[PDB]
From Swiss-Prot:
Reactions listed under catalytic activity: Thiol-dependent hydrolysis of ester, thioester, amide, peptide and isopeptide bonds formed by the C-terminal Gly of ubiquitin (a 76-residue protein attached to proteins as an intracellular targeting signal)
Gene (UniProt): rep
Biological role stated in the UniProt entry: Responsible for the cleavages located at the N-terminus of the replicase polyprotein. Participates together with nsp4 in the assembly of virally-induced cytoplasmic double-membrane vesicles necessary for viral replication. Antagonizes innate immune induction of type I interferon by blocking the phosphorylation, dimerization and subsequent nuclear translocation of host IRF3. Also prevents host NF-kappa-B signaling. In addition, PL-PRO possesses a deubiquitinating/deISGylating activity and processes both 'Lys-48'- and 'Lys-63'-linked polyubiquitin chains from cellular substrates.
Activity modulation: Inhibited in vitro by GRL-0617.
Effect seen on changing residue 31 to A: In strain: Mu/B.1.621
Effect of residue 164 to L: In strain: Gamma/P.1
Limits of the Macro domain: 1-167
Protein name: Papain-like protease nsp3
Organism: Severe acute respiratory syndrome coronavirus 2
Topology relative to the membrane: Multi-pass membrane protein
Complexes and interactors: May form homohexamers. Interacts with N protein.
Location(s), subcellular: Host endoplasmic reticulum membrane
Whole-protein coverage range: 1025 to 1191 of 7096
Length: 167
């Protein structure tokens, strides 16, 4: 039993809700919140910009030190950093950004990072400003993640479409 509330159950392990991931994380304080990161951990817009703003830019400061030490992530890769005031940990995951011409096949590799954590609050990878089809992202999530994932979907029209189209 966990403290996630109001989710629709899609499979044994995948749940979904129309919610602002920032407001969700503040309420639940999950062990892991997933950020929709880029390889530079430049948290400018989308989920990343929103999460960073909620940390008063502390996420960006920590991220800049991470990059200075380690260099950029790989597309499809991840790193674990602090969750600041939002969660214990933030798993920064880089899905392919279609608006940069990145291979959508790397979306499965991106979701594989979730399997290293028993429970996660997450957005749909490569959705939103990353340009991929969110219905496809949900399908890859369900077919790749085996741990317990609570998906927050920002856009209401998208949430209803994802549920009503889910197979
Ligand atoms: O798949 C990630 C989605 C993409 C979108 C499609 C339409 C509108 S946003 N973004 C988010 N999902 C959940 N919480 C969020 N908080 C801020 C942004 C955000
Ligand atoms: Cl977005």
């Amino acid at each position: 039993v966990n403290s996630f509330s109001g989710y629709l159950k899609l499979t044994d392990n995948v749940y979904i809700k129309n919610a602002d991931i920032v407001e969700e994380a503040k309420k639940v304080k999950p062990t892991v919140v997933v950020n929709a990161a880029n390889v530079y951990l430049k948290h400018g817009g989308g989920v990343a910009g929103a999460l960073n703003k909620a940390t008063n830019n502390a996420m960006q400061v920590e991220s800049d030190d991470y990059i200075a030490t380690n260099g950029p992530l790989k597309v499809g890769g991840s790193c674990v950093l602090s969750g600041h005031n939002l969660a214990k940990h933030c798993l920064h995951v880089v899905g392919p950004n279609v608006n940069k011409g990145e291979d959508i096949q790397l979306l499965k590799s991106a979701y594989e990072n979730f399997n290293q954590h028993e429970v996660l609050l997450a957005p749909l990878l490569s959705a939103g400003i990353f340009g991929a089809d969110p219905i496809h992202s949900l399908r890859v999530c369900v077919d790749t993640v085996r741990t317990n994932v609570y998906l927050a979907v920002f856009d209401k029209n998208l949430y209803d479409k994802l549920v009503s189209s889910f197979l």
